[PDB]
Amino acid sequence: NFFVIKAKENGVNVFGMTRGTDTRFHHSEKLDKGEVMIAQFTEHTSAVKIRGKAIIQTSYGTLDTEKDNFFVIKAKENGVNVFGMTRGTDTRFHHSEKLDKGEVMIAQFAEHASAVKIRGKAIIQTSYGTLDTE
Amino acid sequence: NFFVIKAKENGVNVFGMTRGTDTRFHHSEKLDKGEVMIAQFTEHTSAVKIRGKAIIQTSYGTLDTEKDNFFVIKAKENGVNVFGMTRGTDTRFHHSEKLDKGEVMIAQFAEHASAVKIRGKAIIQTSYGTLDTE
Amino acid sequence: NFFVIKAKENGVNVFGMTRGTDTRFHHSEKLDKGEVMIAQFTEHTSAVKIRGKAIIQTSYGTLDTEKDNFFVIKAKENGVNVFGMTRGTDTRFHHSEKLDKGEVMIAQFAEHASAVKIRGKAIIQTSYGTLDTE
Amino acid sequence: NFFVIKAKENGVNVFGMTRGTDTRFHHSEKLDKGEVMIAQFTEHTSAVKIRGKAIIQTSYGTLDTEKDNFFVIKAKENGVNVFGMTRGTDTRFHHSEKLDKGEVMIAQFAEHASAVKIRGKAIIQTSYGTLDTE
Amino acid sequence: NFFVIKAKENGVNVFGMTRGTDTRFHHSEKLDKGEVMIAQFTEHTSAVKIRGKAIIQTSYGTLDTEKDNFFVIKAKENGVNVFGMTRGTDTRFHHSEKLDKGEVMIAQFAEHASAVKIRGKAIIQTSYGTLDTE
Amino acid sequence: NFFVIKAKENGVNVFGMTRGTDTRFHHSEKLDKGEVMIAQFTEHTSAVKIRGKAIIQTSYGTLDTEKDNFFVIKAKENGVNVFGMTRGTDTRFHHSEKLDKGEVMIAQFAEHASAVKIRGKAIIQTSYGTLDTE
Ligand SMILES: N[C@@H](Cc1c[nH]c2ccccc12)C(=O)O
Ligand SMILES: N[C@@H](Cc1c[nH]c2ccccc12)C(=O)O
Ligand SMILES: N[C@@H](Cc1c[nH]c2ccccc12)C(=O)O
Ligand SMILES: N[C@@H](Cc1c[nH]c2ccccc12)C(=O)O
Ligand SMILES: N[C@@H](Cc1c[nH]c2ccccc12)C(=O)O
Ligand SMILES: N[C@@H](Cc1c[nH]c2ccccc12)C(=O)O
């Protein structure tokens, strides 16, 4: 699937994380107020990160950061962290992406990892419905 | 498909059972109050077990343990047991997983077993509807 | 697809009939009052038989025996019989399964047979709707 | 797909026509009052003919003869005839099946023929809707 | 998909145009008042033409000529013409089929051509909706 | 999928852009007032451009230029520009198509590029909904 980002201010940044064993951001793009971006998940990229005031549209619904198979994480407060579990018999926990208040994350279940653990106060969007940690 | 677990208290534990001839738990993870976990069925794992106060969301619906193709078993009282039948001409009965009151189980129909027998008082969720043993 | 059986009394029995040229029951299982069973059609088995007071859930709907692609046969009275036609140019009639009052049958259209003839007073469930012989 | 026939009287007969270059009936079966038959289209058979008082259920709907991809033809009066066109560059017209009042026909679009011409007064059922020649 | 033609008068004619580089009519059939024809698009034929008072049923809806992936063209007045564009880098315009008032055309997007230009006053039916040139 | 263009005036022009590494217009066609065109995306072409008063119909809805997987861009004012990101590890920005007020653009996500950036004031149509930059 594909997602849409609209910038409500200047300073909105988006990051692309590689599909593979490790989860780090390799590219970053800057959006100005009123600009809109459309992107699709590809072989290289399986997840993205969003920071700043912006509007996000997805099949699950439309999400705004100012308000107070794939999944979406929105950080309600500071200290939000997410971990990913390795596929197969392996039992490692090596993924550490911290989301500050107002930031948003989107990721897909790939071969290298198809199970995720989430920490802190955040809002989760899924095909079933919307979930609030608090 | 994939499922979501939300912890309403500390002490919530989840177990992963291997896909194969035998059904035993090999890994266990601990969730704190307010944490949320998302996982998908993979080649290694075909079923899971849940104990403690937690909220579970599935395509069939949202299930809570505090209230008093794949299937979900919720133990209404103690003494709940489940058995699985072997595929093909074989007629063995070698699966014994006991669920205490408040515990929940989720499993998929795999090649090694695609028929299940359930004992005791429990609540069953399926694509057709919700069933109560009592 | 898969079906669900719930036992309203003790003495409920279920039979599994082999997928192949001949239609005979090779395995039988016993259910106690309040127990529930879930099974899926496999390579070995293409049809089943049910006797006694029980509740059956299917995509077509939920069926109870006490009330007075695949198909379901419920025997309204004694003397219910079913015959199956052989696939291809062959014109044999070699299937004889008699259903007593209250018994239920479920079968799938397989390569060896994809056409069925029914005798006696019975209730038929199909993807189109419910049919009564009387 | 598959169809269902229910007999409202004795003397109801059904015919099976072969899938191939020529369209003739090779087998015939007799149904008694209150009996029901279920059959599926196979490699050998691509069409059938029905005569007498009977009830027919199909995805398009339920049809009764007493009332006054595949298609269904019901003869409103005597003199109903149907012709089939050969696939490809050929322009022959060699199919002649006459339907008397009350008779019903069902056929599938096969490789040897995927275009049909109909004569006389008849009622036609299709995935789009019901059509009356008069 | 397949379409249905019903003749409201005598003199109704239907034409079949070949699937290939060139678009000419090779076969023609005559329908009498009250007759009905059903045909499916095949390898040889990708489009048809209809003239005279007739009733046409399609997934988009039912169309009548007397009223004053594939597409349907109905000529509202005389002088209606249609052109087809060649697939790939080629930029030819070699298709000229003129439709008189009351005539109807149906065609499919094939490998040799998947883009069409229409002239004159006509009514167009598509999966999205009905369009009127005027 | 395919799209439909209807011309509300003379002077309406449509352009076809090649599927490949570079995005330039190779062919151009002229439409007169009241004419209608239907075209489908092919191997050669993955996007188009529209200028002038015209009516466009798409699965997302019907769009008119006079009003004041694939996506549609409508330029609300002058200065609208769009950029496309290269698939894979590459991080180039080499696409520059400027849309004047009233012009419309349609494009598909291809192998060479599946992520787009948009500038200026424009109206965006997607399977999720309609988005306005302002
Ligand atoms: N390492 C496991 C992770 C996993 C899958 N399903 C689970 C259910 C519960 C806990 C862990 C898991 C895997 O093969 O993907
Ligand atoms: N051993 C059987 C189990 C089974 C399948 N379908 C059934 C129906 C009824 C009872 C048992 C079964 C198998 O091949 O899977
Ligand atoms: N012996 C036939 C039975 C059959 C199939 N379709 C039918 C329709 C009507 C009557 C009989 C049949 C076969 O090849 O399966
Ligand atoms: N002989 C033609 C018959 C046919 C197919 N499609 C048609 C549409 C209209 C008229 C005739 C036809 C064929 O190849 O099958
Ligand atoms: N010759 C072009 C025709 C075409 C396709 N899409 C278009 C869009 C606009 C104009 C022309 C076209 C092709 O490869 O099919
Ligand atoms: N070059 C990247 C572009 C991209 C894909 N997904 C993204 C998400 C955010 C930013 C850029 C991207 C690619 O080919 O996939």
Side-chain angles (χ1 to χ4, degrees), chain C residues 67-134:
Chain C
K67 179 188 169 63
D68 296 341
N69 264 267
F70 64 91
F71 64 94
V72 176
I73 304 181
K74 173 179 167 185
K76 184 58 57 163
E77 290 300 326
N78 193 10
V80 176
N81 199 352
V82 67
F83 323 115
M85 296 296 172
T86 46
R87 190 178 288 228
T89 62
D90 189 358
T91 183
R92 298 294 296 163
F93 64 91
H94 212 56
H95 288 335
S96 182
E97 293 82 3
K98 177 174 173 281
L99 312 173
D100 303 347
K101 180 179 173 79
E103 299 192 319
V104 177
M105 183 177 176
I106 309 179
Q108 263 204 320
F109 296 131
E111 271 315 290
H112 293 282
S114 63
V116 175
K117 192 174 190 182
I118 297 169
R119 283 275 199 163
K121 314 180 181 177
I123 308 309
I124 302 312
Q125 295 298 109
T126 61
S127 61
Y128 324 121
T130 183
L131 184 146
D132 189 358
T133 56
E134 315 316 297

Side-chain angles (χ1 to χ4, degrees), chain E residues 31-83:
Chain E
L31 282 72
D32 193 359
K33 66 190 168 185
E35 277 55 30
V36 64
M37 169 157 301
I38 316 182
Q40 208 159 351
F41 292 99
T42 187
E43 180 177 356
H44 182 17
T45 81
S46 66
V48 294
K49 322 204 288 280
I50 297 169
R51 58 212 291 200
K53 309 287 187 153
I55 301 299
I56 299 161
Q57 299 222 30
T58 61
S59 301
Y60 311 137
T62 294
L63 183 63
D64 62 358
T65 65
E66 183 154 274
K67 179 188 169 63
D68 296 341
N69 264 267
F70 64 91
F71 65 94
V72 176
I73 304 181
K74 173 179 167 185
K76 184 58 57 163
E77 290 300 326
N78 193 10
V80 176
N81 199 352
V82 67
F83 323 115

Side-chain angles (χ1 to χ4, degrees), chain A residues 85-92 111-115, chain B residues 3 5 14-17 27-29 37-49:
Chain A
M85 295 296 172
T86 46
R87 190 178 288 228
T89 62
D90 189 358
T91 184
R92 298 294 296 163
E111 271 315 290
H112 293 282
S114 63
Chain B
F3 49 77
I5 295 92
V14 55
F15 298 78
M17 271 155 38
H27 312 146
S28 171
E29 287 77 69
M37 169 157 301
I38 316 182
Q40 208 159 351
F41 292 99
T42 187
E43 180 177 356
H44 183 17
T45 81
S46 66
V48 294
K49 322 204 288 280

Side-chain angles (χ1 to χ4, degrees), chain B residues 1 17-18 20 26 31 38 56 64 76 83-84 91 95-96 98 103-104 115 119 121 124 128:
Chain B
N1 214 17
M17 271 155 38
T18 300
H26 272 278
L31 282 72
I38 316 182
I56 299 161
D64 62 358
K76 184 58 57 163
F83 323 115
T91 184
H95 288 335
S96 182
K98 177 174 173 281
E103 299 192 318
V104 177
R119 283 275 199 163
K121 314 180 181 177
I124 302 312
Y128 323 121

